[PDB]
Amino acid sequence: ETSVVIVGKISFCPKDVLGHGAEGTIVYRGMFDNRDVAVKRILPECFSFADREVQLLRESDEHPNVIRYFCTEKDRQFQYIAIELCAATLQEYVEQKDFAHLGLEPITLLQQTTSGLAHLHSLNIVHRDLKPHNILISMPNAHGKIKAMISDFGLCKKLAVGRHSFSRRSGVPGTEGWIAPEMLSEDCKENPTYTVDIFSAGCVFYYVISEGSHPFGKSLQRQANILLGACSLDCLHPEKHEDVIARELIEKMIAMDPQKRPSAKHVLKHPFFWSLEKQLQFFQDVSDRIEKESLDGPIVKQLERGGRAVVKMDWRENITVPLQTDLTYKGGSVRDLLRAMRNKKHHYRELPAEVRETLGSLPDDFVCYFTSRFPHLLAHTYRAMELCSHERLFQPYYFH
Amino acid sequence: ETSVVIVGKISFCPKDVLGHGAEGTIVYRGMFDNRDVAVKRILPECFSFADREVQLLRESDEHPNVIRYFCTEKDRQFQYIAIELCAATLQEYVEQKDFAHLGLEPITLLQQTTSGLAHLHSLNIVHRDLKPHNILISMPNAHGKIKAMISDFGLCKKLAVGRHSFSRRSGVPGTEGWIAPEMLSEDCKENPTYTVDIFSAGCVFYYVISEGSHPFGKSLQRQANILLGACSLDCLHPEKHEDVIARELIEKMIAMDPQKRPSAKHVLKHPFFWSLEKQLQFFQDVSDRIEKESLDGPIVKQLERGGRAVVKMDWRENITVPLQTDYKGGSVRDLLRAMRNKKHHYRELPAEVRETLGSLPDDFVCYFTSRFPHLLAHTYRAMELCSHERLFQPYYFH
Ligand SMILES: Cc1ccc2c(NS(=O)(=O)c3ccccc3Cl)cccc2c1Oc1ncccc1-c1ccnc(N[C@H]2CCCNC2)n1
Numbered sequence: 147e148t149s150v151v152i153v154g155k156i157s158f159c160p161k162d163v164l165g166h167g168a169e170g171t172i173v174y175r176g177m178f179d180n181r182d183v184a185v186k187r188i189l190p191e192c193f194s195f196a197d198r199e200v201q202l203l204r205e206s207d208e209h210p211n212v213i214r215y216f217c218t219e220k221d222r223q224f225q226y227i228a229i230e231l232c233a234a235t236l237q238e239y240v241e242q243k244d245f246a247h248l249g250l251e252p253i254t255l256l257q258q259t260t261s262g263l264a265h266l267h268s269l270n271i272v273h274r275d276l277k278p279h280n281i282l283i284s285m286p287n288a289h290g291k292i293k294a295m296i297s298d299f300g301l302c303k304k305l306a307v308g309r310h311s312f313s314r315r316s317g318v319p320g321t322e323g324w325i326a327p328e329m330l331s332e333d334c335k336e337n338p339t340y341t342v343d344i345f346s347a348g349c350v351f352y353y354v355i356s357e358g359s360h361p362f363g364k365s366l367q368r369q370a371n372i373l374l375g376a377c378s379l380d381c382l383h384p385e386k387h388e389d390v391i392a393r394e395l396i397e398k399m400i401a402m403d404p405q406k407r408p409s410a411k412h413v414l415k416h417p418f419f420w421s422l423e424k425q426l427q428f429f430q431d432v433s434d435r436i437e438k439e440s441l442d443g444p445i446v447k448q449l450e451r452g453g454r455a456v457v458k459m460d461w462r463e464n465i466t467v468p469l470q471t472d473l474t475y476k477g478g479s480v481r482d483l484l485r486a487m488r489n490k491k492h493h494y495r496e497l498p499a500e501v502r503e504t505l506g507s508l509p510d511d512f513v514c515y516f517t518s519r520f521p522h523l524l525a526h527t528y529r530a531m532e533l534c535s536h537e538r539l540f541q542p543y544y545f546h
Numbered sequence: 547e548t549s550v551v552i553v554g555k556i557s558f559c560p561k562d563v564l565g566h567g568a569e570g571t572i573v574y575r576g577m578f579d580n581r582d583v584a585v586k587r588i589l590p591e592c593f594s595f596a597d598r599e600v601q602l603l604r605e606s607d608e609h610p611n612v613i614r615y616f617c618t619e620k621d622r623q624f625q626y627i628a629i630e631l632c633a634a635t636l637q638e639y640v641e642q643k644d645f646a647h648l649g650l651e652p653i654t655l656l657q658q659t660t661s662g663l664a665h666l667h668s669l670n671i672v673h674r675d676l677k678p679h680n681i682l683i684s685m686p687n688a689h690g691k692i693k694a695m696i697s698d699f700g701l702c703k704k705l706a707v708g709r710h711s712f713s714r715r716s717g718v719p720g721t722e723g724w725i726a727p728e729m730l731s732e733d734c735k736e737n738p739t740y741t742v743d744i745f746s747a748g749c750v751f752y753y754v755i756s757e758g759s760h761p762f763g764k765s766l767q768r769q770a771n772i773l774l775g776a777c778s779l780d781c782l783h784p785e786k787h788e789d790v791i792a793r794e795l796i797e798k799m800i801a802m803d804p805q806k807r808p809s810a811k812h813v814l815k816h817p818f819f820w821s822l823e824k825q826l827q828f829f830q831d832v833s834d835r836i837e838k839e840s841l842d843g844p845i846v847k848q849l850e851r852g853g854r855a856v857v858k859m860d861w862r863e864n865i866t867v868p869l870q871t872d873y874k875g876g877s878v879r880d881l882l883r884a885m886r887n888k889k890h891h892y893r894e895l896p897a898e899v900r901e902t903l904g905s906l907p908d909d910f911v912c913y914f915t916s917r918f919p920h921l922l923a924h925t926y927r928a929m930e931l932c933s934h935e936r937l938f939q940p941y942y943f944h
């Protein structure tokens with residue numbers, strides 16, 4: 147327990163176990179090329195399997211958010227794979243880190259996870275075992291930035307060219323509590339495909355922003371709840387703007403019907419990942435698009451459907467008194483709510499002093515003024531203006 | 547000759563020479579981990595130097611556009627460094643490739659080169675030897691996409707913490723023809739710094755977009771011309787929008803006075819790299835910023851200075867007649883107001899007018915930039931007055 151194993155360019159002390167894999171697989175902290183590495187040791191029974199994994203990584207385009215091996219070695223008794231030593235798994239990050247001052251970092255790790263996934267899917271690889279345990283969080287670089295990396299390719303499937311799904315077998319479907327329902331359900335009439343990864347990631351999304359919860363309950367009940375379709379996201383409050391949008395995305399990602407789940411590239415286009423500037427730009431593009439638009443036309447009809455709850459009966463009554471004074475719009479209309487936001491954005495410099503003060507700076511404070519008071523505004527408008535998905539001017543906002 | 551050298555995980559046939567470095571250095575094609583690699587072989591007198599180069603890269607953050615070593619090996623007689631086998635140097639790219647169908651790819655290679663350089667600078671590294679020959683172009687990935695990678699760190703300098711320049715010595719300044727004037731000039735009263743790389747890079751930009759020319763002339767006259775400040779960019783035509791924009795950036799990058807050259811991060815914000823869509827959004831934001839501005843005010847006065855040449859004396863007389871159907875023609879500001887207005891009311895204005903303009907945003911902005919090739923460049927420079935306002939953050943590097 148004080149020895150150092152040396153195999154080619156990889157060395158480690160066996161006492162420094164970082165974790166355990168399946169079939170007698172152990173991961174150690176060791177060293178390579180004067181760097182810290184994690185080293186997976188492989189038993190003879192798994193040599194061919196480990197080789198196939200390495201080869202899949204060897205052949206595939208690299209991506210910053212997909213783990214990359216540093217070195218492989220082999221002696222008489224074992225094979226070894228070294229990867230970069232990371233700070234934490236996503237599980238440990240969620241369990242241990244105070245989110246209070248991390249700002250958007252946890253969200254960027256989900257965005258980075260979705261990019262790694264989109265990369266895999268674009269290579270016709272389905273992961274099938276996405277979970278917080280095997281999403282790895284790097285050490286900070288020179289400017290304090292960290293990144294998420296997908297690992298653990300032991301269950302992945304590279305689909306043949308021209309193949310878009312895989313059929314169910316008796317064997318290993320994933321990790322209990324993270325397995326999409328079409329892997330286990332009884333009356334499933336469609337092959338599993340890339341979207342099993344989106345279900346898992348949906349669960350991962352909620353796990354991160356709820357800091358430890360899971361849409362399908364505590365671990366002992368999860369997989370059973372998944373088959374029943376019994377999910378709950380009550381860590382997301384219906385009157386908080388950021389929560390309404392996260393819920394909007396996560397509900398689609400974990401949909402029981404795989405065909406209703408967005409693809410990874412779709413997910414990446416969602417308002418969840420929008421800056422405040424882009425949120426405001428969306429509101430302005432929408433408002434520009436829907437003026438001259440008829441009042442009984444399908445678009446503004448879609449927008450005003452259930453809009454009373456969105457504007458809170460009368461949005462004229464739910465803004466500060468400076469803006470109230472400086473405003474003849476229709477208070478039960480979301481279109482006119484949007485019209486008023488664009489108008490005041492446009493003439494922002496002409497606004498009286500007390501008004502620019504109550505609104506805040508452009509764009510961040512300005513848009514927060516409205517999203518914080520009307521928490522359903524973005525999500526409602528995002529879904530309503532999906533009628534214009536195809537239109538070129540709405541390309542930045544939806545995935546075509 | 548027909549043998550294979552095997553050193554640890556690296557192997558190669560010595561017949562497969564890809565090139566020669568300095569001091570007996572040779573680069574071969576070979577193999578590593580079942581991949582194609584380029585293998586540099588280093589002689590004993592360069593062991594320590596090569597070790598320092600590798601160490602610099604081992605410690606420094608990686609970046610998609612800075613070369614990464616795959617492997618290092620060492621026997622009794624040599625040391626070896628393997629990197630990824632690339633398709634070409636930027637020199638070979640420019641010399642061999644037909645640009646006619648490459649679209650924006652060559653510009654994209656410049657942008658990735660600048661991102662590599664920005665990354666190096668943010669790690670307080672000065673490269674000091676940027677040139678087409680050591681900018682490498684990757685093989686295509688699965689989607690046919692390629693990238694540029696900066697290599698050759700033999701002259702680089704990592705400046706100590708809280709140090710921003712390096713002083714001149716009698717020794718190696720770089721590669722003749724790509725050496726910034728302040729490395730060799732007579733009455734230079736300021737230390738060289740990061741911007742020696744911006745000077746080289748500016749020469750590289752022109753080399754790519756001119757497909758083989760150099761701002762300071764043919765190979766034998768270049769460095770002498772750099773000393774004189776005698777440069778020419780006449781592959782770039784004064785009445786072509788794209789050429790005007792490239793000229794605006796490149797002239798700054800190769801400025802004799804280093805303090806007038808943009809940092810790599812400034813470079814990356816320049817309209818040279820802007821999509822047609824972003825060019826339009828710029829014209830709209832500019833229009834919005836100045837709509838209430840005073841005519842005598844320092845902002846629109848800046849914009850109207852030299853304005854007549856930009857709008858061709860009268861811009862109303864230089865557009866198509868279906869647009870002339872529906873301002874002050876000697877004013878840049880009114881040209882921009884007209885553009886913003888027509889974009890804003892694009893849906894509700896007649897069909898034949900929408901036809902001559904073209905679809906939004908690409909064809910619409912090109913209607914005006916093709917007819918007023920100095921409009922963007924002029925406006926970008928003038929509106930640098932608002933470059934620290936949050937609203938113009940997308941357009942200028944703060
Ligand atoms: C999860 C995972 C999955 C697959 C791995 C794997 N297999 S693979 O499918 O990803 C693969 C990758 C490349 C080539 C082949 C293969 Cl099979 C190989 C190696 C490691 C793998 C791996 O890594 C680990 N597995 C178990 C425990 C720990 C780590 C680990 C890795 C890096 N850093 C850290 N840091 C510690 C520091 C203390 C605090 N906690 C974090 N821990």
Ligand SMILES: Cc1ccc2c(NS(=O)(=O)c3ccccc3Cl)cccc2c1Oc1ncccc1-c1ccnc(N[C@H]2CCCNC2)n1
Pocket residue numbers: 564565566573584585586596599600603613614615627628629630631632633634635638679680681682697698699700
């Ligand atoms: C330029 C350069 C600079 C520095 C190198 C270098 N040193 S370094 O300073 O970049 C460095 C990098 C990492 C670690 C240490 C060091 Cl010293 C090491 C290895 C190669 C280096 C290198 O590479 C070469 N040098 C000379 C000739 C050819 C290549 C080369 C490299 C990859 N692909 C191809 N493809 C051919 C295929 C046919 C068509 N033409 C392109 N050619």
